[PDB]
Design goal:
This protein is an alpha+beta fold. Helices cover 29% and strands 25% of the residues.
Length: 389
């Protein structure tokens, strides 16, 4: 009936399993990250009616926000998108530059509708864990009897990724890049590279720091080959703030995620979703800093930077304007949005976030994270789930 969590025994060979499968960040700084000492059990109806169908519909609503924003200079201004990039973002949308993936983050409310907290539509991680490692967990768990033998999992992510790379096939090499000094980012990009290569797409990896420029600002690799298409685990808004940002206007190279996705990874998406779909069951009231609050006196509320990751610089306020929770981060100088407050559900002493995956426009799986405060932070743990009943 109700979604629940229960303890399960950790596999006695977890560390070997993680090594054999390339999961080199399952423990981070000698702290547990991958946490299979518990698991969440959903019914198929909860999956289809409360997560999958709402995710697919919310994505369509977001595409309507993109379409409205690129045609309205007041909206682009509210989103704080630099005017230099308005034309090339509008053109990116006009050409329908292809999207690969994105992840929506949800507050679970029991039998009530889930509430969308934000759309990590540019550089989401926890992909390897959601698409791959928790499926191997499911297979082992079914065999060992710690969950029902016929348990399923809301997870078609790898299949949809491979099929998308097939659709996007090109004989020109497909570059993949991330920054140095983060195993998680590299393994996210390596996982996408493996999916691409499974679809027959030749792929090459290059660190962001090793990207070069040829005469006239042409993007090149370390052997001075011209990069014509790249997936980047690097934020679009930093690309546009960089001194070389103006070179994006020429559209000489293809980017994944594409430029128009900068509208969806902007947390200004949340006020716009509320403006254009007021009262939608899966939405929270939201407004830009400086607009009249859309909650009554007394209610708690959340202030978020328009650009941030892992709860960075998020503050939850109570209705007396005291701090309920706060997270450090590198985003303190970004403009801010406000949102009505729906607490994450609490299981034991953990607060649980649902990440719901989109591949192109299709809702196709979810991964769960747990943390010790109301704001999901960098200390969070990934927890497997399964479907039964």
């Amino acid at each position: 009936h109700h979604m629940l969590r229960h303890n399960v025994p950790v596999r006695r060979d977890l560390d070997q399993i993680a090594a054999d499968n390339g999961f080199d960040f399952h423990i981070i700084d000698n702290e547990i990250y991958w946490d299979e000492s518990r698991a969440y059990r959903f019914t198929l109806r909860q999956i289809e009616e409360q997560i999958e169908k709402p995710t697919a519909e919310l994505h369509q609503m977001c595409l309507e926000v993109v379409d409205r924003a690129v045609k309205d200079e007041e909206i682009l201004t509210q989103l704080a998108i630099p005017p230099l990039y308005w034309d090339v973002i509008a053109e990116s949308w006009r050409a329908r530059d292809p999207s690969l993936y994105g992840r929506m983050d949800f507050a679970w409310c029991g039998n009530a509708p889930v509430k969308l907290l934000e759309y990590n539509a540019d550089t989401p991680t926890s992909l390897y864990e959601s698409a791959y490692f928790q499926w191997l967990w499911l297979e082992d768990a079914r065999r060992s009897g710690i969950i029902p033998r016929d348990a399923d999992q809301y997870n078609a992510i790898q299949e949809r990724l491979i099929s998308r790379f097939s659709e996007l096939y090109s004989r020109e090499p497909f570059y993949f890049c991330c920054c140095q000094d983060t195993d998680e980012d590299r393994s996210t990009v390596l996982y996408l590279q493996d999916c691409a290569q499974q679809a027959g797409q030749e792929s090459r990896f290059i660190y962001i720091e090793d990207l070069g420029l040829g005469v006239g600002g042409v993007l090149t690799d370390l052997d001075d080959n011209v990069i014509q298409r790249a997936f980047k685990l690097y934020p679009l808004e930093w690309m546009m703030r960089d001194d070389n940002g103006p070179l994006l206007r020429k559209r000489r190279e293809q980017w994944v995620e594409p430029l128009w996705k900068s509208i969806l990874s902007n947390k200004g998406l949340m006020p716009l979703l509320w403006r254009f779909f007021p009262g939608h069951p899966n939405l929270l009231a939201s407004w830009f800093d400086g607009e009249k609050p859309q909650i009554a006196a007394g209610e708690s509320y959340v202030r978020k930077p328009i650009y941030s990751r892992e709860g960075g610089n998020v503050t939850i306020f109570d209705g007396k304007n005291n701090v309920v929770d706060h997270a450090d981060g590198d985003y303190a100088d970004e403009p801010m949005i406000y949102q009505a407050f729906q607490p994450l559900p609490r299981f034991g002493d953990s607060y649980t976030l649902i990440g719901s995956w989109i591949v192109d426009d299709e809702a196709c799986g979810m991964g769960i994270r747990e943390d010790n405060t109301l704001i999901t932070k960098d200390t969070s743990r990934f927890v497997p789930h399964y479907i039964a009943g």
